[PDB]
């Protein structure tokens, strides 16, 4: 079959710069069977490029596609504010399956900003219900790549946390991430130290926000 690879995962440019997105085809398909799509949250995918290099009507001219048959490129000549989204390439005919690529997120360039790290102990109202949720907040950071590590009495937690990230703020171009560590009331009362270890490009050393039960 065909395996699609897109690089980079995140492409970070300023509004007005040129964008070049790579889509790699493992076995390499006919140039008529490579399409590009733009996806904004809440809206259906939007066909930007079909047949490697063609544009459907109503697609601005700044969007341009090219490809050799096994390597494909989507070019945005001048990045407009509405162009910051996720872009997928798709095997449109050489399937089946008509596989979509993993996707490339085009976000707004910015100087590196370290996250403001906050930790929130669980409330007594929630503790009385039998569940304990410990929230760690990474506030206003850039770039998007952030590593959150929960430590309960210096024990690395793994599969009992969930991350949620806001969309890139339109004003300062920063992200905000929440990490919630959920435990039962019994396990929570057994341990004392609860820490949140953050790894980000803006921090020289990993910042630890901790408290004792």
Ligand X SMILES: *[C@@H]1O[C@H](CO)[C@@H](O)[C@H](O)[C@H]1NC(C)=O
Residue 26 touching another protein (CB under 8 A): no
Total residues binding another protein (CB under 8 A) = 57
Give break positions in the chain: residue before each, C–N beyond 2.5 Å. none
Give the β-pairing of 10-13 and 104-108. Answer: parallel
Closest CA to 71 of 7, 119, 141, 23: 23
Distance CA 150, CA 133 (A): 12
Restricting to residues 41-100, which ones interact with another protein according to CB under 8 A?
44-45, 47, 50-51, 54, 56, 86, 88, 90, 92-100
Residue 28 touching ligand X (CB under 6 A): yes
Closer residue to another protein in complex, CB, 84/88: 88
Residue 105 touching another protein (CB under 8 A): no
Q: Which of 17, 30, 163, 189 binds ligand X (CB under 6 A)?
A: 30
- Nearest approach, Cβ of 86 to another protein (angstroms)? 8
8 pairs with which residues across the strands?
none
- Nearest approach, Cβ of 94 to ligand X (angstroms)? 3
Distance CA 32, CA 42 (A): 29
Q: Report the 10 Å Cβ neighbour count for 10.
A: 12
Binding region for another protein (CB under 8 A)? 1, 30, 32-33, 35, 37, 39, 44-45, 47, 50-51, 54, 56, 86, 88, 90, 92-103, 116-123, 125-126, 129, 131, 133, 135, 137, 139-140, 162, 164-166, 176, 178, 180, 182, 209-211
């Amino acid at each position: 079959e065909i395996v699609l690879t897109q690089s980079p995962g995140i492409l970070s440019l300023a509004p007005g710069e040129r964008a070049s997105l790579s889509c790699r085809a493992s076995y390499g398909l006919d140039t008529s069977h490579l399409a590009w799509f733009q996806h904004k949250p809440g809206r259906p995918p939007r066909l930007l490029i079909y047949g490697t290099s063609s544009r459907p009507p109503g697609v601005p001219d700044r969007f341009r596609g090219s490809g050799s048959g096994t390597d494909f490129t989507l070019t945005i000549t001048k990045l407009e504010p509405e162009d910051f989204a996720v872009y997928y390439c798709q095997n449109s005919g050489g399937g089946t399956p008509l596989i979509f690529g993993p996707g490339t997120k085009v976000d707004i360039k910015r100087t590196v900003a370290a996250p403001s790290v906050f930790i929130f102990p669980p409330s007594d109202e929630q503790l009385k219900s039998g569940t304990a949720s410990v929230v760690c907040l990474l506030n206003n950071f850039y770039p998007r790549e952030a590593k959150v590590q929960w430590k309960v009495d210096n024990a690395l937690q793994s599969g009992n946390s969930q991350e949620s990230v806001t969309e890139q703020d339109s004003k300062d171009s920063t992200y905000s991430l929440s990490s919630t560590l959920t435990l039962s009331k019994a396990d929570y009362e057994k341990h004392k130290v609860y820490a949140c270890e953050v790894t980000h490009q803006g921090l020289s050393s990993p910042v630890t926000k901790s408290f004792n039960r």
